[PDB]
């Protein structure tokens, strides 16, 4: 455009070249030409408008093909250009511009750094315009300004002052019902507010003293149905706090006025079917959403707003009826769709209210009024809402007792009702278990049940019926241990029996339940052989509604102190031979071949996996039979999971289930694992090619939380299969990382680098004997995508290679190695160039400052040899100044400083630390925090009590 662009520096020799790249439609030439383009067209001010209605035209797409390309130098201008141009003539055309000028992320991380000089005045830009606010202006000034505030290292501090009051100011009008002006705001009030939650108090115990009235009046909608979700979340502590002082308790009447004032009309669409809550008891991560009974279900994304909506009540309604029996009356309201609402409330509000014997015996008494329905529902949820009552210490005054005794026949009576029998299995579950009857008692109620298996046997064979019968299985195992094999075997009969895996009736609408986890470990006391392992948590992944509560429950508890609140084989053999027909009547379906029906028999496999190996020990001819039959079916469905749209996901289905059973990669656990089941280990074995045909055929979210998405769900586990089968062919590479794994994860393609980041920390921290240019590689390519300018200002590129690095503080913490001279390399980008640049954020630090940590653990003198100041002056000066989401986690580590040295030094330290904590008078918001970190000394080395505590009086 060489005098193409001589036309831009006239009238229409200039106008011309103008519409000519809109045709087409280093750029500082163009741009830079362009302005002083948009300079002369300035000028021009009815008839002049045509040439600058279409300039920002340009200006939204003479970028589309440089924003990625575009450096910081270059913005800064655009940024002045653009606040000086107007200093709506060109509005709606310029404020597009920005819109498409900040959606590569990269752009308003990059922007903020460095004093955040870009950052400031885009901020002004955009605050100023809402101030005079054409409804078509804002919502791109809005969602520009959004898309600002939502970056890790957004210096919202330094411009909280106005910023907090003007998307307040937009939606303090209740009009123009709904859209993004209630969306591109929603969603900053809770990303700028829950920044500023953990310091500047003041600000928002006074603002969320006004949102609330907002909350109670907003009642595809669902996309704004999540952010109020999000905005109780992060705020149900100030809810607390207010309710501990008059206009605010006169709102929060109207909000949970509200929580009833919606469940009405939806009793149809969906109101947490018992289908999304499972009974089950595998060991799951405490991170977990549970109700003190049963638990949400892993890997179900669209089934969180509900629970989220009930949480949020029973976490806000008793602390309304605490502070201020308000949901009784919601009981005795003779209105259906307001008391299944209360009636499945009852175990969330029971987890943290515990009412006494004026509300206990008040609500027992009615729910034994609902037990006897009739309805799938109600004769469902009341039996749960009773047993969430009875795990309380206040539920054993036996003036009550006879419902329990009252509705325990009620189950025992109900294990036949087909709509109605899991939600009755729990109520003798808890029962049972509560502990409410002796053991003679409920003898025979056990006794029919395990010897009759046909009437009120456990109709559905189900998690929570085979979680059930295993107390009776072990009871009936209880009294009577001589010849109580026979107890056992009217169940594995009624089990398979019960079991029906080829079907379309059960194994479509009670498929969803049944684990492979609480089916087997009913069989795995039979023998008396062996529990499946199950050592560690359960990995699995979740949905923005609750990832965006990982980020709070890391610190309440610091804002909960900002505001002051023969005989072994006699059943073999039957097994063994029963388990027979079940193989081939799944395998008459060998051939045969949609989803969900394929799920049973995807879950069939790992019940005969782990089986299958102890189905073999008599060699009947059905033994190897067994085991050369089970796998005849998998490889059908391996032929039908490859072959499919992948639009409905099947092979992610394949991979949730298998997920349970892939144990820790750690060696010795793994070798445990060959020398017993490898049917099981084949199935993996046979999988892992089975996975490789789609690859022979970016990123979501840039949070530390990459590693809970969906994404990268189906690319960590996708991994710890590859190198499981990679394993059990050849043995010749356990106890080190095989090598074309480690060849592999350097194919991969950037944000597949990110999204593992929680898979190559589980390997490499384990011991092991790494390649020569396997350690280097990764940690090289873990170079080339910090330093280019896409994750350089990247909360999860630089909490990646600070991962990696801890890994191995001991093979480059020895000598001068190829490998040795390159983390040092790296090391001064972090701590001298990343670090005060503003280049990190909370996240980051958090993930910096806790290497420092495991460094003088291991070295105490790096920096003592490079150049650089000190890793013990680093962390602290990081202390200093920080995001309170940083301070709040050294406070916590840093009384492990103080475990790195003889006891006569510990006093000359605090000298540091004291040096270091912030001393400011008339800022509270830092001084809460200095008398915070000086209990956590005290409260751990005694060596330290005198000075703590005469510094605490001192405050």
Same mark, same amino acid.
């Given at each position: ?95 597009? +511009? ?10 308003? %991380? ?70 993004? $002006? ?24 006074? &603002? ?157 008494? @009615?729910?034994?009024?609902? !037990? ?23 539920? #054993? ?14 189950? +025992? ?17 808890? =029962?049972?278990?509560?502990? $409410? ?16 298996? @046909? ?28 010849? /109580? ?46 529990? &499946? ?25 610091? =804002?909960?102190?900002?505001?002051? &609140? ?43 996996? &782990?089986?299958?190996?102890?189905? !073999?020990?008599?060699?009947? /001819? ?11 079916? !998998? ?21 949730? /289930? ?10 010795? %656990? ?54 499981? @089968? ?12 095989? %090598? ?26 384990? @011991? ?83 290497? $420092? ?16 100041? /000190? ?53 509270? %918001? ?13 409260? #751990? ?15």
């Amino acid at each position: 455009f060489k005098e193409i662009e001589s036309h831009l520096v006239s009238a229409t020799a200039r106008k011309d070249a103008v519409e000519a790249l809109i045709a087409y439609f280093a750029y500082h030439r163009l741009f830079e030409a362009l302005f002083r383009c948009t300079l002369i067209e300035k000028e021009a001010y009815a008839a002049a408008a045509a040439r600058l209605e279409r300039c920002p035209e340009a200006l939204r797409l003479a970028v589309r093909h440089g924003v990625t390309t575009i450096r910081r130098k270059t913005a800064r201008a655009i940024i002045d250009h653009i606040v000086q141009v107007l200093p709506m003539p060109l509005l709606a055309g310029y404020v597009k +511009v920005l819109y498409e000028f900040l959606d590569n992320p990269a752009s308003a %991380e990059n922007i903020a750094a460095l004093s955040g000089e870009g950052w400031e005045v885009c901020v002004d830009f955009c605050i100023d315009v809402l101030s005079r606010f054409g409804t078509h202006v804002a919502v791109d000034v809005l969602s520009c300004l959004y898309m600002l505030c939502i970056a890790h290292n957004a210096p919202i501090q330094r411009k909280a002052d106005r910023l907090p009051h003007v998307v307040i100011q937009l939606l303090q009008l209740r009009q123009m019902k709904i859209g993004e $002006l209630q969306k591109m705001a929603f969603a900053t009030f809770n990303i700028v507010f829950q920044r500023m939650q953990a310091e500047d108090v003041a600000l928002c115990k006074t &603002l969320v003293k006004q949102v609330v009235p907002l909350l109670s009046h907003w009642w595809m909608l669902n996309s704004i149905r999540d952010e109020m979700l999000k905005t109780l979340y992060g705020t149900r502590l100030y809810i607390q706090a207010l309710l501990r002082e008059e206009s605010f308790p006169q709102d929060v009447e109207e909000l949970l006025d509200t929580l009833w004032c919606d469940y009405s009309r939806r009793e149809e669409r969906a109101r947490l079917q018992l289908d999304d809550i499972t009974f089950t008891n595998m060991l799951l991560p405490p991170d977990h959403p549970r109700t003190g009974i049963f638990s949400l279900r892993p890997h179900h994304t669209a089934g969180e707003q509900n629970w989220a909506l009930l949480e949020n009540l029973a976490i806000l309604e008793a602390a309304y009826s605490k502070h201020g029996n308000r949901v009784h009356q919601k009981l005795h309201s003779l209105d259906p769709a307001v008391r299944l609402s209360a009636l499945q409330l009852i175990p969330f509000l029971t987890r943290h209210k515990k009412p006494s014997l004026e509300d206990v015996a008040e609500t027992l008494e @009615d729910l034994s009024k609902h !037990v006897t329905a009739k309805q799938a529902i109600v004769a469902s949820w009341a039996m749960l809402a009773c047993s969430s009552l009875a795990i309380h210490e206040v539920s #054993r005054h036996p003036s009550l007792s006879s419902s329990w005794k009252q509705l325990w026949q009620l189950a +025992v009576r109900s294990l036949s009702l087909p709509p109605i029998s899991r939600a009755s299995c729990v109520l003798l579950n808890s =029962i049972l278990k509560a502990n $409410l009857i002796p053991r003679h008692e409920l003898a025979d109620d056990i006794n029919q049940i395990v010897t009759t298996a @046909d009437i009120s046997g456990p109709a559905i064979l189900v998690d929570a019926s085979l979680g059930l019968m295993l107390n009776l299985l072990r009871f009936r195992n209880n009294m009577f241990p001589n010849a /109580s094999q026979a107890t056992s075997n009217h169940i594995i009969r009624w089990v398979f029996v019960r079991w029906s895996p080829a079907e379309l009736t059960y194994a479509s609408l009670h498929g969803t339940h049944a684990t492979p986890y609480d089916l087997v470990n009913l069989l795995r006391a039979c023998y008396g052989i062996s529990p &499946l392992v199950m050592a560690q948590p359960l990995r699995l992944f979740n949905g923005p509604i609750v990832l965006h509560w990982k980020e709070q429950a890391e610190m309440e508890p610091f =804002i909960r102190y900002l505001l002051l &609140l023969a005989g072994s084989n006699a059943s073999r053999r039957l097994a063994l031979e029963l388990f027979y027909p079940k193989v081939e009547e799944l395998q008459e379906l060998a051939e045969s071949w949609s989803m969900e029906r394929l799920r049973s028999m995807v879950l069939a496999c790992l019940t005969g996996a &782990l089986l299958l190996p102890d189905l !073999v020990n008599i060699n009947s /001819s059905l033994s190897r039979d067994l085991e050369s039959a089970v796998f005849s079916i !998998v490889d059908a469905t391996l032929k039908v999971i490859l072959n499919s749209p992948p639009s409905e996901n099947l092979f992610g289905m394949i991979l949730a /289930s298998s997920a349970p059973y892939i144990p820790h990669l750690i060696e010795p %656990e793994l070798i445990a694992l060959k020398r017993e089941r490898p049917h099981l280990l084949k199935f993996f074995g046979k999988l892992s090619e089975a996975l490789y045909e789609r690859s022979r055929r970016t990123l979501p979210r840039r949070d530390i939380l990459l590693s809970y998405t969906p994404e990268a769900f189906y690319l960590e586990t996708s991994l710890r299969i590859h190198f499981l @089968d990679i394993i059990r062919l050849n043995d010749g590479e356990i106890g080190r990382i095989p %090598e074309p794994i480690i060849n592999q994860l350097a194919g991969l393609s950037g944000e597949q680098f990110l999204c593992c980041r929680e898979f190559m920390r589980e390997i490499f921290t384990s @011991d092991a004997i790494v390649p020569l240019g396997g350690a280097t590689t990764i940690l090289e390519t873990a170079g080339h995508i910090v330093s280019r300018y896409e994750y350089a200002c990247c909360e999860v590129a630089l909490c990646n290679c600070i991962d990696i690095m801890d890994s191995f503080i001991n093979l480059w913490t020895d000598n001068h190695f190829d490998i040795a001279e390159m983390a040092g390399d790296l090391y001064h980008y972090l701590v001298k160039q990343s670090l005060p640049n503003n280049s990190m954020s909370a996240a980051a630090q958090i993930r910096l400052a806790s290497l $420092l940590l495991h460094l003088l653990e291991v070295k105490s003198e790096y920096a003592s040899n490079l150049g650089l100041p /000190s890793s013990q002056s680093t962390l602290l000066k990081i202390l200093q100044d920080g995001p309170m989401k940083l301070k709040h986690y050294i406070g916590l580590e840093i009384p492990k400083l103080f475990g790195l040295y003889v006891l006569k030094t510990h006093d000359d330290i605090f000298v540091d630390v004291l040096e270091h904590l912030p001393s400011d008078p008339d800022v509270v %918001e830092g001084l809460a925090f200095r008398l915070f970190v000086l209990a956590e000394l005290a409260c #751990r080395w005694p060596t330290l009590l005198r000075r703590s505590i005469y510094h605490t009086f001192e405050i």
